[PDB]
Each structure stands twice: as C-alpha cells, then as structure tokens.
C-alpha cells in the first residue's frame, strides 16, 4: 500500500510556552532554519496553530531512509552553530513528540 | 507578523483506524474515494499512514485559500451522493478523528 | 469574589460519537428526544456539533439554579419511561462522554 | 443538520497556573474583555471551573463566518491596547486549545 | 517519613464502561459478583459510579496489608471458576480500565 | 442503582511538582488539614502515589448534598486561615481535577 | 555523546487490548505467532502484560542494529502469508497500539 | 499465562524538561545509577527517546516480589547518598509514572 521508491516523512509537533509562537518563529527564521536545512536536506512544511491546539508548532521533513535520517541528525547535533542556536528555543518548547509516517500511493508528497 | 500576508490555510486531519485496517482503508480510498474527495476539496497536500508513533494512524493535509472557501467546498463534498455512497466503506474503519487549521511559517516551503 | 453572588451553574456535556454518526444523532434528538429532555432539565443554553477540532463531537450546555435542583431534575429525567425509551436511539451512537460544572465570570453574558 | 443561516461558535479552553483563576478573571474584567469584545463582536459566555478540570477557563464567541473571525482577530492582535494587556495573562495560561463548532437546529444559540 | 510505618496499601481501580451500561453493570455486580469478589480480595473500601466528571465511570477501592498478599488474593480470585463464570457478565460492559496503588497520608482516616 | 439516602463523594486528584509529595504532605498535615476538615466535615481518605501516576495526591470528601458542599467550600475559601495556608501548596500543585461520584448500593462507604 | 557509538535501537510496542483479552491473546501468540514473528524480526528483548497500571496492556520490545534493517525485517514479516494468516487471531483483540524507538543509555545492560 | 517462578518488571517513564536528556543521563551515570543499583538489585534496561515522545526516559527494573521491591526502595530512599543525589534530577523530571508488568511465558526476560 505504498510505492516501492518513496520518502519517509518525519512529523515533529511541539507545544510551546504560552504566547511564544512569534518569538520562536523569529529566532528559527533568523538563525536556526538554514542550519537545520543544511544538514537535514528536505524541509517539507513548517506550521503554527490557528484552530486546534494553541501554541503548537508542526514541522515536517522528508528522508530517503531512516539510517540516512540518523546520519544527518547526528551531523546537525555536532554542528557548533546548531549547539549555539539551541538555547534560543530550548525553553520555548515545553513538550515535544515525533513520528515517522509513509506516503500513500496517491499522496502528492511521495 | 510571523506569516506572509498572502498564504494558504492548512487543514491537518488525523484518524485512528480500527486495528489492522490501514491496508483495507488505503485500498478503497485509492480505488473509490480520493478522486471524488479531491474534486470537491481541491488541493491535497499530503496523505500519510503511520510507521513509528501512533499505530493505525492516517494523516492527510489539504490547503485552502480561506476558511469560508473551505466551508463551501466541504458542504459540496457532503452533499454529493457519490461521496455519501463512498463513506460507508471507510466510516467504520475510522474509530477516532480530529482536525486542526494551521498557518505556514514564513520559511515553510508549503506557503 | 470573582463571580456574582446570584448566578446560574453551567453544565457542559461533551460526547464523542461513533465515527460518522453526527447526522443520525442530531436527527433523532431533534425529532424524538430534545423536547422530553428539556421538559425535565429546564434551561438548555446551547447545543453544538463539531466542525474544526475533535471530530464526531457533541457539546451541550444546561443552566441550573443549584446543583441540588440539577440532581432532582436529572432523577426525574432518568425515571421517565418516555426518556428511557428514547435513550436506545442514541446510547450506541455515543462512545465516550464527560460532564463538568462551571460558574460564570462576572462579565459573562450567560449569568 | 444545521440551519442555513447560523453562527459559528468558537470554544476556547485554557488551563491556568494553579490558583490563578481569581487573578486572571480580575485582569480580564478590568482591562481585557472590553478590548476583546470591541473587535470580536459577540461574546457568548465566559466560565471558570467548579467540578471537573480545576484551574480551567472556557470562553465562547460567535462569528458570522470564519473569514470574518479571521479579520476581527487580526484587528485585535494589531491593537496596541491588546498587545499591552497580553503580558498580564500570558504567563497565567499554561495550556490552551480552541475549536469551532456549529449549532444544532434546536440550539437556542443559533 | 510521610506515612505511618504500619499502614494498608490502597488499590484504586477505574473503569470506563460502554455508554449507558452503569445500571446493568451495577445490577449484575450486586446480584452475582461482589460477594465472590470480596471473598477473595478481602477489604472493599468503596465502590462508586460517576455523577459529575467522566461519564460511564466505575471506581472501586480495596485495602491490602501487603502487595504480595494482594497478589496471592488476586491469583485465587482469577482461579475461581465461580468468578470466571461471572466475568462474562461485565467484561464487555467495561471498555477501558486502569489500576494504581497508593499509600495513606498520616492524616488519612483510611489508614 | 444507589440507596435513597446516600452521601456524594468528591474525588480530588492533583499532580504535584516532581519530588514535592513529602513537602506537600508535611504542610497539609501541620497547617491545612484541620482547617479544611473544620469546614468540609467528612474527610474520607487522603492518599499519595506508589505505583501508577507518580507525584499524585488523591483525596476524598463526603457531602450530604452538592448545595451543602457549595456552602461549606465557600466558608472554607472565606476563612483567613485557609487563605494564609494556600500559598504553601499553590505552587506545589501543577495540575488538578475533581469529580463527584455516588456510592453503589454495596459500597461500604455509603 | 550520551550513548555508546555502537549500540542497538530498541522498539517498544504498546497495545491496549479488548477488556479481558490478555489470556486469549497470550495463548494464541505463544502457540501460533511468536516463533513466526521472531523469525523475521530477530531479537525479542522482552514481552510483558500488565499487572499494576494500565489494565489489558501488552508491551513488547525488540532490538535492531539499524532502522533500515528494522524496515527490511518488518517488510518480510508483513509479506509472509504465515504471519498474515496468524494476524486475524489477534488483530481484533488489540484495540489501540503505538510504537516508539529509543536508544540505550551508556549504563543500560541492554546495549 | 505466566511461569510459576518469574520476576516482576517495573517500567518507569519520565518526561524531562525540554533539552534535559544529556544532562540527566550524565548525572545519573556519574552519581546516581550505582547507588540505585546497589539497593534495587536488577537493572534491566535504561533508555532515552529517539522517535516517539521527545525528552523521555524509560527505565526497567526486575524484582522477585513486590514486597521485596518495597523493602529495597525504602532502603534506597533512606540512603543519604541517594538523598544527596536527588536534587540533581528532581527539577529535570517534569512528569513521571510507573507500572508493574509480568513476563509472558515466551519472554526472554523472565
């Protein structure tokens, strides 16, 4: 029920400190996202709450395999630029979770 | 402001299926449902099933230019007897469901 | 004190229905249940079904002058064979349910 | 299963810092609610916990359409008076969520 | 230490029933189950059903002198064909269940 | 399915700051519980975690009716001694909820 | 780094069963399923059922040298008609399920 | 459906302060785990998040009986070395829970 060649989609969901969405999005835009992209490779989407959970961030990344994901994230974590960035969001995120999902055969994101 | 002035709204729909129902669900959606659903709702962004995390989960994402337009589209979907005749094939496969509306960050490739 | 001395108590009842059951539920409640239910419980405040958020959700709200009066009203509701004969038509449509009692803020239009 | 002409009901539910209901209700009454009403238009109800979740606020607003809701909330967020008010509740709210619901045909709130 | 040295352990068992099943459940437990259950488990502390909060909920509480004794008692309960023949009458009325072990505060009347 | 004359049981469940059970139980024992009992009337049980949720308090009170409960709690909240006590637990409790339950006919607590 | 460079990945699978289904589930898994499952997935670490906490719960844990290897193993499991013919015997006993991947601490005996 | 002679497995799950896994694992390794093992007796496994809940610790201990567990934990709690250690993780853990589980007959951990 999925195509032979397909990407894996990681969905990361964060609940932020109440009111922190603007500050979080600013520092990620200005400093974090380009570092993150440079290691992880395919940012799919990056969203914030409007109706539903409030103070929520959802971001989605595509990976050719989970071993490749692991290698890429390890390089990200070892990057001094990322380590310098992290304190700027570490206390804005309260609770976090991730999942890996696969595309249906009819998903436009394959 | 922390989003672009002109942007799409993203609806994320998350279903927990009856245990073991993913293959049956995806089959009948592919063969009998998704073209009808797209023909009303418009821009399907992505359609996923779970591998690590919640098991038996479906997530699908749609983009809309406004929530009033979303509303008009869903009304047409729900009034279409071609869709109402399809729904019985998945509505017992789905146990629990939720949706949310989110906006894209300025740096989201999905704008 | 952060509420008016004389005020009503608000009961908010939230149900998660069987997936896809909202239209059937609302039909039979309208046609066969709500007048009987109101005739015991009294002041219905609002009765809603979900659009964005939890799917398959019903929320209904009732106002009472006291919780002892609420109790007496619900006892009469539950003893009425006209209501007990109605309940089978929704009790399998409802999967999960909860209620809570809340008080109005001083600036609530619902006092 | 709803009337052709009807309002949309937004239900906002907040879990506050333990013990914060009195302080929250005071500052909302004294400063926030009139600003909020002036932009949003139809406050329906505004409630706090008694039996159930403790430290909870539930407030309900009616809107003629979700596009109208969006316009109104944007004006609220741009109001310097609201921006000055927000710090007074931003740290009293811990967790928050909202939903949009529609009235049944037999709802007294239509 | 924040409890008395000699104290009982309290097991709190919480069930969510099938919607509307409380009256049927309580009837058959009263008539056919609770005496057998007590005869193995010992000291029933309290047995409650919900009014405001979660709906369709049962909470029952048992006291034990030790958790090894609890274990031996539950093993005997589960081995008794009189109990295994009773269980079918409630096991489909119960949807979801959990238990926890708690200790009494020094100022708890239940010691 | 309950006896005509019966009490109502309020079950209050608190999740505390991690590690706070000892400190919480000490100050409640030394200062709070006697004040609380004096207004509320029938403490049934007062428990803390051992296996299950960690950092949890569960306490149970019996009331002849919910209107009587309301009157008693109002007097408790107006007692300067209780108002002086509350700051000593207000920040030890993180999340809280209550429910009202009724006794089965075969409950030893009736 | 807070783990050893060479380590296994641990998958923890948690199921909530139909109330009262643990004995039936464990019987048929023992007799008809676990050897087939092990023959694809490899290193079973532990397989548990609940006593205090969530009731009707199964937790099983598997170790993998890499997530790509896990993926290849699960694909082979799901393609095996011997496993697909076994699944009907548990897939209605399981109500809700989730999995997670965790790494061992440096001081974990499971490395 | 379990073997006559078998161990009980305690599974302890903690959600930490966001970003705290490295610091937590360091202080547990350097100071806490040897004290803990010395009283509790059979550490089975000790894990941290990778995909699923983020900021999560799961640790598993085996006990011959729950009375033995109780005795061992009481000695741990009375150990001045453990009492000196606890402040170093008390505020890194936000939410915690434990459960006791039994091994299936075919579990390699018996």
Q: Which residue has the tokens 């304190």?
A: A87
Number of domains in chain A: 1
Contact G20 E91 (CB under 8 A): yes
Contact D18 F95 (CB under 8 A): yes
H48: which 2 tokens? 């941290």
Of the candidates H12, H90, H100, the beta carbon closest to that of F18 is on H90
Structural domain span for residue G96: 1-110
C69: which 2 tokens? 């009066």
| CATH number of the CATH domain containing G56 | 3.30.70.100
- Longest CA–CA span in chain D (Å) reads 43
From residue H6, how far is each of B33, B83, G15 by CA, in Å?
51, 55, 22
Residue A78 CB neighbours (<10 A): 11
Across-strand partners of D110? none
Element (H, E) at F99: strand F93-103
Alpha helix ranges (H) inside B1-111: 22-28, 34-41, 67-79, 81-84
| Sequence-separated (6 or more) residues with CB below 8 Å from residue C51 | D8, D99, D100, D101, D102
Q: Which residue has the tokens 């071993």?
A: A67
C-alpha atoms less than 13 angstroms from C-alpha of E33 in its C-beta half-sphere = 17
Q: What single string gives the DSSP state of each residue in D54-73?
A: SSEEEEEEEES-HHHHHHHH
Contact indicator for C64, C11 with CB cutoff of 8 Å: yes
From residue C61, how far is each of A93, C64, E33 by CA, in Å?
34, 10, 37
Query: Which one of E74, E97, E101 would you mutate to disrupt binding with G, by most G Cβ within 10 Å of its Cβ?
Result: E97
Q: Which residue has the tokens 């048929």?
A: G28
Contact A52 D100 (CB under 8 A): no
C42: which 2 tokens? 């009294």
How many beta-carbon contacts under 8 Å exist across A and D?
27
* Cα torsion angle, C50, C54, C56, C60, sign: negative
Q: d(Cα B56, Cα B97) in Å, to the nearest integer?
A: 12
Size (chain C), residues: 111
Q: What is the resolution of the experimental data for this entry, in Å?
A: 1.5
Exposed / middle / buried, residue B58 (Cβ in 10 Å: 0-12, 13-18, 19+): buried
Query: Coil, helix or strand for B47?
Result: strand
Q: Which of D63, D6, D61 is nearest to D33 (CA)?
A: D61
| Sequence-separated (6 or more) residues with CB below 8 Å from residue E9 | E63, E64, E65, E66, E67, E70, E101, E102, E103, F50
Q: Which of E9, E72, G52 is nearest to H100 (CA)?
A: G52
Contact indicator for D14, D28 with CB cutoff of 8 Å: no
Asked if D touches F (at least 3 Cβ pairs < 8 angstroms), the answer reads: yes
Contact indicator for C97, E56 with CB cutoff of 8 Å: yes
Q: d(Cα B19, Cα B55) in Å, to the nearest integer?
A: 8
Considering only CB atoms, which residues of chain D are within 8 Å of chain F?
Answer: 15, 18-19, 51-55
> Which of F18-42 are b and which e, b meaning 16 or more Cβ less than 10 Å from the residue's Cβ?
bbbbeebbeebeebbbebbeebbee
Experimental determination technique: X-ray
Query: Coil, helix or strand for G84?
Result: helix
From residue A13, how far is each of A55, A57, B53 by CA, in Å?
11, 6, 12
Number of H helices, E strands in chain B: 4, 4
- Nearest 5°: CA angle at C30, between C24 and C34? 125
Q: Which of H95, E107, D19 is nearest to F26 (CA)?
A: E107
From residue A58, how far is each of A50, A65, A107, E108 by CA, in Å?
12, 21, 19, 45
From residue F107, how far is each of E38, E46, E65, F102, H52 by CA, in Å?
11, 5, 20, 10, 42
Contact indicator for E83, E74 with CB cutoff of 8 Å: no
Within 8 A of C23 by CB-CB distance, chain D residues are 1
Q: Which of C12, C29, C34 is nearest to C94 (CA)?
A: C29
- Give the distance, in angstroms, between the CA of residue B64 and the centroid of all CA atoms in the same chain: 12
- Give the distance, in angstroms, between the CA of residue D97 and the centroid of all CA atoms in the same chain: 10
Query: Which one of H11, H67, H68 would you mutate to disrupt binding with E, by most E Cβ within 10 Å of its Cβ?
Result: H67
| Sequence-separated (6 or more) residues with CB below 8 Å from residue D92 | D16, D17, D20, D23, D24
First vs last C-alpha separation in chain H: 12
Q: What single string gives the DSSP state of each residue in chain A?
A: ---SS--EEEEEEEEESTT-HHHHHHHIIIIIHHHHHHHH--EEEEEEEEESBSSEEEEEEEES-HHHHHHHHHHHHH-HHHHHHTHHHHTTEEEEEEEEEEE-TT-S--
Q: d(Cα H48, Cα B54) in Å, to the nearest integer?
A: 18
Within 8 A of H70 by CB-CB distance, chain E residues are 66-67
Contact B102 A1 (CB under 8 A): no
Contact indicator for H3, H105 with CB cutoff of 8 Å: yes
What is the DSSP secondary structure assignment for residue G29, as one 8-state letter?
I
């Amino acid at each position: 029920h999925h195509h032979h060649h397909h990407m894996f989609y990681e969905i990361r969901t964060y609940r932020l400190k109440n009111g922190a969405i603007p500050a979080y999005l600013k520092v990620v835009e200005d400093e974090g996202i380009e570092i993150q992209k440079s290691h992880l490779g395919e940012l799919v989407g990056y969203f914030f709450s409007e109706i539903g959970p409030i103070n929520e961030i959802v971001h989605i990344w595509a990976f050719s395999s989970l071993d490749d994901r692991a290698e890429r994230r390890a390089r990200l974590m070892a990057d001094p630029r990322w380590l310098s960035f992290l304190p700027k969001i570490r206390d804005l995120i309260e609770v976090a979770e991730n999942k890996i999902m696969k595309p249906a055969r009819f998903s436009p994101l394959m």
